[PDB]
């Protein structure tokens, strides 16, 4: 709209799955690359567990009940903690 164009992230939809998908490709050759890949992996998988806030094999196939939504986040974060 102006002679100085403006970027803005596509409003926040899929970046967690782009980042988690990207590190799930770097894992194919991460066996020998060491810089801060585990530090960034811990942070971005924590962000997925917390404000994931993404697909969970239809976490709800039908309708969400906040008790179920929060128990299912405790399952996902418990699986993260076990994997860490």
């Amino acid at each position: 709209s102006a002679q100085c164009p403006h970027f803005k992230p596509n409003a926040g939809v899929a970046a967690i799955h782009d980042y988690a998908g990207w590190v799930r490709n770097l894992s194919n050759e991460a066996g020998e690359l060491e810089a801060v890949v585990k530090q960034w992996g811990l942070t971005w998988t924590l962000c997925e567990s917390l404000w994931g806030q993404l697909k969970e094999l239809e976490a709800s196939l039908d309708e969400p009940n906040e008790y179920v939504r929060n128990l299912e986040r405790r399952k996902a974060f418990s699986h993260w903690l076990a994997h860490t």
Binding site: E63, N65, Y67, V68
Partner: protein, 57 residues
């Protein structure tokens, strides 16, 4: 237990100081979560979800 008085057996275990054994007699309780079908009030989960492991032990 042979008299169907499994609750009296658990009370006896607790009174004799063997509350751990009383807990081993509860592992046969059928798993039920009344909240799975979307009730208006949250009900407490019943039974043992690890029954198969308990039964194998």
């Amino acid at each position: 237990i042979r008299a169907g008085m499994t609750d009296e057996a658990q009370r006896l275990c607790k009174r004799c100081g063997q509350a751990w054994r009383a807990a081993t007699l509860e592992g046969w309780k059928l798993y039920h979560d009344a909240n799975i079908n979307g009730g208006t009030e949250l009900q407490a989960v019943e039974g043992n979800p690890y029954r198969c492991v308990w039964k194998t032990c």
